[PDB]
Amino acid sequence: CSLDQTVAPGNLTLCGNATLFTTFRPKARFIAPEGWMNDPMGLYQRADGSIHAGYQSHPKHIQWGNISQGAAYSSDFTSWTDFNGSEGYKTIWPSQIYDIRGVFDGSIIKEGIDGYPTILYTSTSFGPLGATLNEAEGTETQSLAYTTDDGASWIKLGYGAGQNPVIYEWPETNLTGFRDPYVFQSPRLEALLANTTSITNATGDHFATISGGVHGDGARLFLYRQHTTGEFIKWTYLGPLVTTGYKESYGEWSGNYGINFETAGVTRLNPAGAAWDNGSDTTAVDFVTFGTEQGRADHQNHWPLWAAVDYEVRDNGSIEAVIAYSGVQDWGRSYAYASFPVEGYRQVSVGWIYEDDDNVILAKQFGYQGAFTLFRDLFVKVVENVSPSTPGLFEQASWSTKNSTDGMSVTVTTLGQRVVPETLAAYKGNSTVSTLAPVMLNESAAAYTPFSSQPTDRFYALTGSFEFGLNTTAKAGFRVLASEEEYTDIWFDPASENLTVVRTASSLIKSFGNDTELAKVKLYEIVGAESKTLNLTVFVDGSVIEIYANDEVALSTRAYPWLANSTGAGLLADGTTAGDVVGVSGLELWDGLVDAWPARPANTSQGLVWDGPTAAMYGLFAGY
Amino acid sequence: CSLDQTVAPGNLTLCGNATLFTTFRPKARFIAPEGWMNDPMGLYQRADGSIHAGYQSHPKHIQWGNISQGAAYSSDFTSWTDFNGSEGYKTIWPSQIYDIRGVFDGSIIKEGIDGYPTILYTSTSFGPLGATLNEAEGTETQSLAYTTDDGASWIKLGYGAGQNPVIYEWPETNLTGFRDPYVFQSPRLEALLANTTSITNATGDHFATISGGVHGDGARLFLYRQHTTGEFIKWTYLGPLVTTGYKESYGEWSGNYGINFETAGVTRLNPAGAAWDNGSDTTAVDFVTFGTEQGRADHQNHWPLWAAVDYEVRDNGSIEAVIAYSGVQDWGRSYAYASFPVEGYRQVSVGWIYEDDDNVILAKQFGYQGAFTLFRDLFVKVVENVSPSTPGLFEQASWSTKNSTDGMSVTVTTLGQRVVPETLAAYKGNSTVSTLAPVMLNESAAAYTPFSSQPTDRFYALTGSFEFGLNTTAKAGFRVLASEEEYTDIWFDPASENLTVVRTASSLIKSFGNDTELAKVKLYEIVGAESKTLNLTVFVDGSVIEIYANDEVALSTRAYPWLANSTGAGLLADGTTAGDVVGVSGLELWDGLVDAWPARPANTSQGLVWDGPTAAMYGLFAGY
């Protein structure tokens, strides 16, 4: 095993555990100190205004198992500090018959048991567990724990009748899943149900969804309401909030609803951010976010989706959320988006970016797996004065249209996503910033044009505004992590409406994924404009490539070039001519970003362990 | 619900939880503070000379579940003090994937991990568990924990490869069970195996047996040897130590070997007590003690047995313990005898006395279930100058015979059992002692003759020597817990060799067991004697009746009379005449005994709890 990054990679499978720890590792984002991580969990803003972020964690392993809450905190979403207690950076772990198989995702009741922040989480026990398996009642239940020290530790309620677990009965028969409780307050839902509280006796100020589905009959999001305010044991099942069909698809802009929901959340937004009105705000929209499984051929069978919904009240005192339009929250290798309220009327969302090593070829050599996305402000994106001649505009697939009185212009409404401003400000201010001259891409444009200033390592951000003719067939974008032999190409093709990430040349190491990523992007044409504009922002962070387009479209992926000098970046151009020109402006490189974990040394590996022969005997965890 | 013990019992099922806590409760013996208990476990003499006694425990329930080690200590086997830590009187509890289903029986390595006392115990996980079920490998494994504070707490080794559990592979296929590790040192076994250590590489100074059997093919005791001295992870399977047939019986004096072993131990004894020689002591005998299951129609299908064994060395460097003769360690409602070494060359044995409420009718009203037997010194009982005309003497069923040179007398050898002298001394010295005049039982004897001094409560001991003619057909014994309407009759019938406990009148409460207990007792006739003598000792302790005959035969049972005055005792006589006389001498009543738990209030109930609906979902524990 050689770690010489000036020559071709050898057989890296011969390398020891965590010998590749720093090689591809993100530095500017949320990531576990070591080992396996997946979904964000237990997210809340603490009383001092700082952010608590939990995550599904399995230390000293590179596959999922014994799933626990790892935790850290931040004053700015950007610079983080690990908790350090008796179990290192873990704060909740399997410990009881009801959760011994794993402490799955959970969410926060800010004012819970005895006034303390309280997590409602999926407590798992023995038995077949999975959407394609024959799961039985009891395998997934929902349990409570509370913290008296701001997330340094959690105290679970006792096991038993009238205690943990608090939700255990399946609300419907033959579930494909029953997990990831999402607890939230909703003046909107309270207002809607106020006339029906006699039917159910449920009058609490907290609601909770549980994600699942029904065998052979599609996914379900189940709605519960806290039964009495200030009391946290009794949760009353109202009915299914979201019901979708078996592998139903809303279309090309909306992924696939699969067979089972995971990690669903419920929010209400307006153009500024989070909306806390009862329905009185006409600019506010109700949204559901949700992961779906087994409706995708690749991306570990997984779609992170969202839908705008209109609530109807059922005669039995429950809520049907009718999908008005439906989109995708990230088009790439990410999943399990959790969102949470933040001061100043904000709703902040964050997900999990998995690796692209599905055959587990270099995982042990990494000594870790997984990172978070960036933290994203959610809001209602409103585009005014849209041209009715925008191709496919009235399909209204993952947006809504409203005509002007005279029918000459359109207002477009959709879900907006933007990186939290604290992260952008910190990234910019800590970077070497190069403001680049505008570039016209025409007949003289090479396929690849390096920027006049170049990155110095694998930690940078790029931004650009790409102006296209209304009938263009040209393609343009960004090449990143680039040397002569290795590079990752981010293309936009307005004629097809396709944003692609081409990874055939991303790395000389052949075991990593190399399939092309794809997002759909609608360029809403503005009345009187003779062009259409794509605003592209790209974050490069070790192996993470995280792409944002127009405060709307997100695509997270991975590239693992071996060569030390595969760090370059520049402009891509295809089919640009004297007549078909792409104007590129607002160009900027941020080199360096932020060291997100200042207290951590470069190598935080603690080695890897094997569970031994009993792992296969129990059959619950891979064991490594 | 009335608790008036001067009138007939009402419907006691209407009584609240633990309302009958003190009514039938033993006061003079080892018992949990409340709730469910079974097997003794983790027994050892600590460095300060005091005794550590653990027990299978389920607080706040009256059925088995979440099985844990409860613990206490004593300087004299007699007066006890509970440990009190973070988990009350528990010191080990289910906490890990490998033992979450129950912390089953374990035994002590006195000088273990880092020199600390160390428990090897059965760690149980999910799956069918039982001799009549289809158990799989991994459901029962063996794990280590050590104590740095003399049993106040235990630290388990980590889960994983080269750590817990330390024994997990089944040594043979299709086991009926794989539990209750018994760790011991044996100069005898070391001497026997010293020539074969090249075959196995196992050279440690500790051995361990694990109890089980093979489906359809009888019980097995499996022998392991510590692989290297001073190292506790690696235990090498040698071979089956004891192999018996499917429901094989050695005869009327030996119970039944059933289908599966539980709680087996290995010891070596001489006439004085424990023997620690390599084989050089000609007066020493090797013994195995073991519980067997599913070979009895009643007594929860359970026999607590013992056998004298002769070891043979196999060619593969293992030991076959060949049964020389085989007996019963207690004939009544007791099981799971554990034995342990004690200073001054002693081997002390103690078991579990279950209740006689198998339909669980008044268990909740009790608020507890179970107690220990008394602690018993084990030794080789030797009877000299035995008459060759003793009926059935040369059957040698649960004893050995050796002829004198001239063939005119016999030496009988058997397993001896006697209550530890510390308990007898403390009991006697704290009691009101009445030494009673000898009584001849003849033609003038009533069926029942009360003693001239009477007990004052349900806590007393009786002793007597019953002298019978060699061809008697008379019966004599003791009546205890007696008023006019309720009483328990302990009879010996030399003609049949049967010691019975007749319980048809034990209680007015009909839900308690009332079947007749039976022990076999061999009266070894002495050369030149014109009579044969039974020495009977009876302990009455709340509901426990514990009977000892001749420092050999033990029978533990239960009686639950309702009436406050059902406390009387006296002599029983049947078919005594002018010609067939029973001489009773050495008669003594000890009224009061010892308060075994001086720090405990009379009512140590903490209420009872229900596990809720998930108990039936998990299917592991009754839930109450």
Ligand SMILES: *[C@@H]1O[C@H](CO)[C@@H](O[C@@H]2O[C@H](CO)[C@@H](O[C@@H]3O[C@H](CO[C@H]4O[C@H](CO[C@H]5O[C@H](CO)[C@@H](O)[C@H](O)[C@@H]5O[C@H]5O[C@H](CO)[C@@H](O)[C@H](O)[C@@H]5O)[C@@H](O)[C@H](O[C@H]5O[C@H](CO)[C@@H](O)[C@H](O)[C@@H]5O)[C@@H]4O)[C@@H](O)[C@H](O[C@H]4O[C@H](CO)[C@@H](O)[C@H](O)[C@@H]4O[C@H]4O[C@H](CO)[C@@H](O)[C@H](O)[C@@H]4O[C@H]4O[C@H](CO)[C@@H](O)[C@H](O)[C@@H]4O)[C@@H]3O)[C@H](O)[C@H]2NC(C)=O)[C@H](O)[C@H]1NC(C)=O
């Ligand atoms: C199988 O057996 C298992 C083992 O028994 C069993 O698990 C155990 O279950 C029990 C029962 O549910 C649990 O007991 C609860 O514990 C809660 C606290 O838990 C935390 O703290 C304990 C103890 O902490 C001490 O010890 C540890 C270990 O040494 C130290 O690390 C600590 O620093 C601390 O040490 C100090 O104290 C010691 C003495 O205790 C001293 O020795 C020492 O010097 C120190 O000073 C920890 O062990 C726990 O850790 C475990 O669990 C966490 C998850 O929670 C894991 O992460 C971890 O790995 C461990 O596994 C944990 O940190 C108690 O709060 C709780 O008591 C409340 O509930 C019960 C009812 O259920 C009530 O009777 C009781 O009165 C309490 O309720 C009151 O208080 C709360 C909060 O204040 C209120 O919300 C409530 O309304 C109520 O209020 C009342 O009083 C008010 C105030 O006066 C009044 O105003 C009100 O009006 C009202 O009346 C309970 O005791 C136990 O933790 C489990 N243990 C383990 C190891 O798992 C398992 O379930 C069994 N399984 C089955 C299937 O049966």
Ligand SMILES: *[C@@H]1O[C@H](CO)[C@@H](O[C@@H]2O[C@H](CO)[C@@H](O[C@@H]3O[C@H](CO[C@H]4O[C@H](CO[C@H]5O[C@H](CO)[C@@H](O)[C@H](O)[C@@H]5O[C@H]5O[C@H](CO)[C@@H](O)[C@H](O)[C@@H]5O)[C@@H](O)[C@H](O[C@H]5O[C@H](CO)[C@@H](O)[C@H](O)[C@@H]5O)[C@@H]4O)[C@@H](O)[C@H](O[C@H]4O[C@H](CO)[C@@H](O)[C@H](O)[C@@H]4O[C@H]4O[C@H](CO)[C@@H](O)[C@H](O)[C@@H]4O[C@H]4O[C@H](CO)[C@@H](O)[C@H](O)[C@@H]4O)[C@@H]3O)[C@H](O)[C@H]2NC(C)=O)[C@H](O)[C@H]1NC(C)=O
């Ligand atoms: C799923 O996830 C689970 C959660 O992570 C996981 O369970 C955990 O597994 C890990 C890994 O096995 C366990 O970690 C071990 O812990 C042992 C000690 O365990 C006891 O103590 C801890 C911590 O105690 C503190 O905290 C509690 C809680 O607050 C307090 O109550 C205590 O009072 C104490 O508090 C003080 O310290 C705190 C900081 O830690 C302070 O905050 C505080 O202020 C106090 O001052 C307890 O939590 C444990 O309780 C749990 O377990 C018991 C049963 O054991 C239960 O009854 C209970 O309910 C709880 O569940 C427990 O009491 C460590 O000894 C051990 O470390 C050794 O082993 C590892 C290798 O495995 C080595 O890396 C390490 O170096 C240590 O080895 C050395 O030391 C030993 C002994 O000294 C030697 O024998 C050994 O040879 C070696 O010697 C070396 O050093 C020598 C000396 O210098 C040298 O001479 C030698 O040459 C040599 O180099 C390890 O850390 C952890 O306990 C589990 N936790 C729980 C909650 O279960 C689970 O397995 C996962 N499941 C799966 C399937 O994956």
Ligand SMILES: *[C@@H]1O[C@H](CO)[C@@H](O[C@@H]2O[C@H](CO)[C@@H](O[C@@H]3O[C@H](CO[C@H]4O[C@H](CO)[C@@H](O)[C@H](O[C@H]5O[C@H](CO)[C@@H](O)[C@H](O)[C@@H]5O)[C@@H]4O)[C@@H](O)[C@H](O[C@H]4O[C@H](CO)[C@@H](O)[C@H](O)[C@@H]4O)[C@@H]3O)[C@H](O)[C@H]2NC(C)=O)[C@H](O)[C@H]1NC(C)=O
């Ligand atoms: C005395 O000690 C007991 C512990 O043994 C304490 O708890 C009670 O235990 C018994 C079992 O011993 C439980 O009985 C079972 O009850 C269920 C149905 O329960 C439902 O209805 C009850 C009656 O109104 C109600 O109290 C229950 O409420 C509790 O539980 C729910 C969760 O379900 C929880 O949300 C609440 O907060 C309460 O904690 C509950 O709604 C019944 O199905 C069982 O039947 C089975 O058992 C028998 C034998 O097999 C059989 O007849 C059936 O066929 C079936 O198989 C069983 O009867 C009882 O519910 C527990 N009560 C509780 C927890 O309050 C008890 O509290 C102690 N008393 C005192 C005064 O402290």
Ligand SMILES: *[C@@H]1O[C@H](CO)[C@@H](O[C@@H]2O[C@H](CO)[C@@H](O[C@@H]3O[C@H](CO[C@H]4O[C@H](CO)[C@@H](O)[C@H](O[C@H]5O[C@H](CO)[C@@H](O)[C@H](O)[C@@H]5O)[C@@H]4O)[C@@H](O)[C@H](O[C@H]4O[C@H](CO)[C@@H](O)[C@H](O)[C@@H]4O)[C@@H]3O)[C@H](O)[C@H]2NC(C)=O)[C@H](O)[C@H]1NC(C)=O
């Ligand atoms: C690096 O990180 C790993 C953790 O990932 C550390 O531990 C090793 O993990 C791997 C899995 O990643 C284990 O490999 C498995 O090994 C078994 C056979 O193991 C036996 O033989 C080994 C080789 O000599 C030996 O080291 C083992 O000894 C350990 O375990 C025993 C208990 O069995 C214990 O008593 C010892 O004390 C040791 O702890 C053991 O005797 C093999 O069956 C597995 O094969 C499966 O996996 C693959 C993929 O499915 C497949 O090819 C097979 O078909 C099969 O399904 C698997 O290969 C390895 O045993 C672990 N080694 C240990 C614990 O020492 C590793 O130590 C870290 N290195 C460093 C330097 O820290």
Ligand SMILES: *[C@@H]1O[C@H](CO)[C@@H](O[C@@H]2O[C@H](CO)[C@@H](O)[C@H](O)[C@H]2NC(C)=O)[C@H](O)[C@H]1NC(C)=O
């Ligand atoms: C019954 O108990 C008596 C009293 O202990 C036993 O008689 C004693 O036997 C020993 C010999 O082992 C003598 O040292 C004593 O002098 C005897 N005491 C007497 C006669 O009072 C007797 O052996 C016991 N019988 C049985 C069958 O066990």
Ligand SMILES: *[C@@H]1O[C@H](CO)[C@@H](O)[C@H](O)[C@H]1NC(C)=O
């Ligand atoms: C790389 O090494 C592995 C062992 O980790 C081996 O199985 C594989 O064949 C090697 N690849 C080569 C020689 O191309």
Ligand SMILES: *[C@@H]1O[C@H](CO)[C@@H](O)[C@H](O)[C@H]1NC(C)=O
């Ligand atoms: C990182 O640390 C681990 C654990 O000490 C070690 O095994 C590994 O070799 C280290 N890797 C690098 C690249 O330093």
Ligand SMILES: *[C@@H]1O[C@H](CO)[C@@H](O)[C@H](O)[C@H]1NC(C)=O
């Ligand atoms: C309420 O009605 C809906 C739609 O018919 C149904 O799916 C749900 O189960 C009902 N809720 C109940 C019975 O609590």
Ligand SMILES: *[C@@H]1O[C@H](CO)[C@@H](O)[C@H](O)[C@H]1NC(C)=O
């Ligand atoms: C650099 O990053 C830190 C951590 O996020 C931030 O607080 C600080 O303001 C940044 N410095 C700037 C913008 O100059």
Ligand SMILES: *[C@@H]1O[C@H](CO)[C@@H](O)[C@H](O)[C@H]1NC(C)=O
């Ligand atoms: C075409 O592109 C080059 C490079 O941006 C530029 O110098 C040139 O002026 C452009 N041509 C026209 C006609 O604008």
Ligand SMILES: *[C@@H]1O[C@H](CO)[C@@H](O)[C@H](O)[C@H]1NC(C)=O
């Ligand atoms: C980068 O490194 C490679 C391999 O060492 C080398 O061939 C090349 O000249 C360097 N520069 C590039 C590709 O721009």
Ligand SMILES: *[C@@H]1O[C@H](CO)[C@@H](O)[C@H](O)[C@H]1NC(C)=O
């Ligand atoms: C654009 O993407 C769609 C899938 O949404 C695909 O069918 C089509 O072939 C793509 N077109 C081009 C030119 O890439």
Ligand SMILES: *[C@@H]1O[C@H](CO)[C@@H](O)[C@H](O)[C@H]1NC(C)=O
């Ligand atoms: C991409 O990976 C696949 C393995 O599935 C391989 O067949 C192919 O050659 C790779 N593409 C390259 C090197 O461009």
Ligand SMILES: *[C@@H]1O[C@H](CO)[C@@H](O)[C@H](O)[C@H]1NC(C)=O
């Ligand atoms: C005693 O009370 C129980 C209720 O605990 C009842 O089921 C039973 O029939 C009663 N027995 C009678 C009236 O004999």
Ligand SMILES: *[C@@H]1O[C@H](CO)[C@@H](O)[C@H](O)[C@H]1NC(C)=O
């Ligand atoms: C004993 O204590 C328990 C728990 O406090 C109580 O429920 C029960 O009624 C008491 N029983 C008696 C006989 O005092």
Ligand SMILES: *[C@@H]1O[C@H](CO)[C@@H](O)[C@H](O)[C@H]1NC(C)=O
């Ligand atoms: C040693 O021999 C005995 C008797 O044949 C056998 O039962 C046992 O399994 C053997 N031990 C081994 C293979 O370790």
